[PDB]
Write an enzyme that holds these catalytic residues in place. Structure first.
Site, PDB file in Angstrom:
ATOM      1  N   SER A  51      -3.615  39.957  64.328  1.00 44.74           N
ATOM      2  CA  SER A  51      -4.328  39.931  65.753  1.00 44.74           C
ATOM      3  C   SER A  51      -3.800  39.970  67.100  1.00 44.74           C
ATOM      4  CB  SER A  51      -4.712  38.764  65.840  1.00 44.74           C
ATOM      5  OG  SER A  51      -5.805  38.378  65.008  1.00 44.74           O
ATOM      6  N   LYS A  61      -5.117  42.616  69.685  1.00 42.12           N
ATOM      7  CA  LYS A  61      -6.251  42.484  70.656  1.00 42.12           C
ATOM      8  C   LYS A  61      -5.850  42.920  72.119  1.00 42.12           C
ATOM      9  CE  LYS A  61      -8.134  40.184  66.403  1.00 42.12           C
ATOM     10  NZ  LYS A  61      -8.806  38.489  66.461  1.00 42.12           N
ATOM     11  N   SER A 100      -9.487  35.262  69.445  1.00 37.35           N
ATOM     12  CA  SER A 100      -8.918  36.179  68.972  1.00 37.35           C
ATOM     13  C   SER A 100     -10.663  36.290  67.875  1.00 37.35           C
ATOM     14  CB  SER A 100      -8.318  35.734  67.580  1.00 37.35           C
ATOM     15  OG  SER A 100      -7.326  36.741  66.952  1.00 37.35           O
ATOM     16  N   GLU A 116     -11.877  44.843  61.564  1.00 37.67           N
ATOM     17  CA  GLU A 116     -11.577  43.512  60.664  1.00 37.67           C
ATOM     18  C   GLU A 116     -12.735  43.608  59.678  1.00 37.67           C
ATOM     19  OE1 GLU A 116      -9.398  41.754  64.006  1.00 37.67           O
ATOM     20  OE2 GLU A 116      -9.887  41.747  61.884  1.00 37.67           O
TER      21      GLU A 116
HETATM   22  C1  LIG Z   1      -5.232  37.806  63.982  1.00 35.40           C
HETATM   23  O1  LIG Z   1      -4.353  37.473  63.651  1.00 35.40           O
HETATM   24  C2  LIG Z   1      -6.470  36.957  63.054  1.00 35.40           C
HETATM   25  C3  LIG Z   1      -7.213  35.858  63.276  1.00 35.40           C
HETATM   26  N1  LIG Z   1      -6.503  34.951  64.656  1.00 35.40           N
HETATM   27  C4  LIG Z   1      -5.453  34.245  64.390  1.00 35.40           C
HETATM   28  C5  LIG Z   1      -4.807  33.822  65.493  1.00 35.40           C
HETATM   29  O2  LIG Z   1      -3.949  33.295  65.303  1.00 35.40           O
HETATM   30  O3  LIG Z   1      -4.958  34.448  66.271  1.00 35.40           O
HETATM   31  C6  LIG Z   1      -6.522  33.402  63.580  1.00 35.40           C
HETATM   32  S1  LIG Z   1      -6.042  31.720  63.137  1.00 35.40           S
HETATM   33  C7  LIG Z   1      -6.628  30.467  64.206  1.00 35.40           C
HETATM   34  C8  LIG Z   1      -8.157  30.650  64.636  1.00 35.40           C
HETATM   35  N2  LIG Z   1      -8.050  31.036  65.873  1.00 35.40           N
HETATM   36  C9  LIG Z   1      -7.221  29.701  65.537  1.00 35.40           C
HETATM   37  C10 LIG Z   1      -6.502  27.882  65.971  1.00 35.40           C
HETATM   38  O4  LIG Z   1      -7.816  27.039  65.198  1.00 35.40           O
HETATM   39  N3  LIG Z   1      -6.538  27.854  67.665  1.00 35.40           N
HETATM   40  C11 LIG Z   1      -5.404  26.443  68.006  1.00 35.40           C
HETATM   41  C12 LIG Z   1      -6.173  26.255  68.809  1.00 35.40           C
HETATM   42  C13 LIG Z   1      -5.597  24.957  68.985  1.00 35.40           C
HETATM   43  C14 LIG Z   1      -4.801  24.033  68.445  1.00 35.40           C
HETATM   44  C15 LIG Z   1      -5.022  24.669  67.140  1.00 35.40           C
HETATM   45  C16 LIG Z   1      -3.096  24.028  66.248  1.00 35.40           C
HETATM   46  O5  LIG Z   1      -2.341  23.890  66.294  1.00 35.40           O
HETATM   47  O6  LIG Z   1      -4.040  23.049  64.920  1.00 35.40           O
HETATM   48  C17 LIG Z   1      -4.780  26.660  66.519  1.00 35.40           C
HETATM   49  C18 LIG Z   1      -6.116  30.349  65.184  1.00 35.40           C
HETATM   50  C19 LIG Z   1      -7.371  34.138  62.946  1.00 35.40           C
HETATM   51  C20 LIG Z   1      -6.747  34.493  61.081  1.00 35.40           C
HETATM   52  C21 LIG Z   1      -7.547  37.802  61.778  1.00 35.40           C
HETATM   53  C22 LIG Z   1      -8.484  36.766  61.538  1.00 35.40           C
HETATM   54  O7  LIG Z   1      -8.201  38.626  63.238  1.00 35.40           O
END
Ligand SMILES: *C(=O)[C@@H]([C@@H]1NC(C(=O)O)=C(S[C@@H]2CN[C@H](C(=O)Nc3cccc(C(=O)O)c3)C2)[C@@H]1C)[C@@H](C)O
Ligand SMILES: [Ca+2]
EC number: 3.5.2.6
Length: 268
Positions: free
Chosen positions: A46, A49, A107, A143
């Protein structure tokens, strides 16, 4: 030697966590401040992006795209983790700017694919890298397949140094107008996905903006910028830690943030 401590501390993390950690820190002109496995290839996942949004802004700056243009879509565009795209689905569209902000700050994968199509696909993303002087980073798929992170695969990869230099070019090197540069900076600061990663390891008075990534086979990445008082830096962190849990991978990246901080604070 503060840089020796930096290297030793990263190697300790690598050894204890069974991980590989790629880091590059550069100044606004792309000059190397410090790094580790700087020119080893890692999957972008990601993190691409952020460059995608820069490409979109370049086109908006040029006039070849308009930020308010409505991009229509149906349910075919929804892929795993598309929170904004799902919410806007009934309305039938997201604007170029809405989609770009969702891709950067949430993301959002659906939003990412929507933009990818409009700018010319992975080939065009790769051409943008080349245009801004990055001969290394490459996008080959959309994606979600670009996140496969198959060991050894050079598709959809960058290096920490190439990406850090790309970040510096976009934020400090004049790739975008002053207005567009400011906007993308604010988007990075307001990112919603990075609270537990790099910025968790930085001092609370540093201005930090970043874009995270998570991919298969233990990939956890975070790229962006930080301003320590008056000094601006661009940074790229790519990690591979197949045996850690998801929470532990977050903590690993935050730990790298602390190692970076110790270096920056000890070299001034
Ligand atoms: C890119 O690598 C990937 C997508 N992006 C991410 C990422 O790390 O960016 C994810 S994983 C996940 C999706 N959104 C997440 C999130 O929960 N953010 C967040 C917000 C608040 C608190 C926390 C915490 O510590 O628990 C996390 C990150 C996704 C797989 C691909 C699909 O494009
Ligand atoms: Ca459809």
């Amino acid at each position: 030697s503060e840089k020796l401590t930096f290297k030793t501390d990263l190697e300790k993390l690598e050894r204890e966590k069974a991980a590989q950690i790629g880091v590059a820190i550069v100044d606004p002109q792309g000059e190397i401040v410090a790094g580790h496995r700087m020119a080893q290839r890692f999957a972008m996942c990601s993190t691409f992006k952020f460059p995608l949004a820069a490409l979109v802004f370049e086109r908006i700056d040029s006039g070849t795209e308009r930020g308010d243009r409505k991009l229509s879509y149906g349910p075919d565009m929804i892929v795993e983790w598309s929170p904004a795209t799902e919410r806007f689905l009934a309305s039938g569209h997201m604007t170029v700017l809405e989609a770009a902000q969702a891709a950067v700050q949430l993301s959002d994968n659906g939003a990412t694919n929507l933009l990818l199509r409009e700018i010319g696909g992975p080939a065009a993303m790769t051409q943008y890298f080349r245009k801004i002087g990055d001969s290394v980073s490459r996008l080959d798929r959309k994606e979600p397949e670009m996140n496969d992170n198959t060991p050894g695969d050079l598709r959809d990869t960058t290096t920490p140094i190439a990406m850090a230099r790309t970040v510096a070019k976009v934020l400090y090197g004049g790739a975008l107008t002053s207005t567009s540069t400011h906007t993308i900076e604010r988007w990075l600061i307001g990112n919603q996905t990075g609270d537990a990663t790099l910025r968790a390891g930085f001092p609370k008075d540093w201005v930090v903006g970043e874009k995270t990534g998570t991919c298969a086979n233990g990939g956890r990445n975070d790229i962006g910028f930080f301003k320590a008082q008056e000094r601006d830096y661009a940074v790229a962190v790519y990690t591979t830690a197949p045996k850690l849990s998801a929470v532990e991978r977050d903590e690993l990246v935050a730990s790298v943030g602390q190692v970076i901080t110790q270096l920056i604070l000890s070299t001034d």
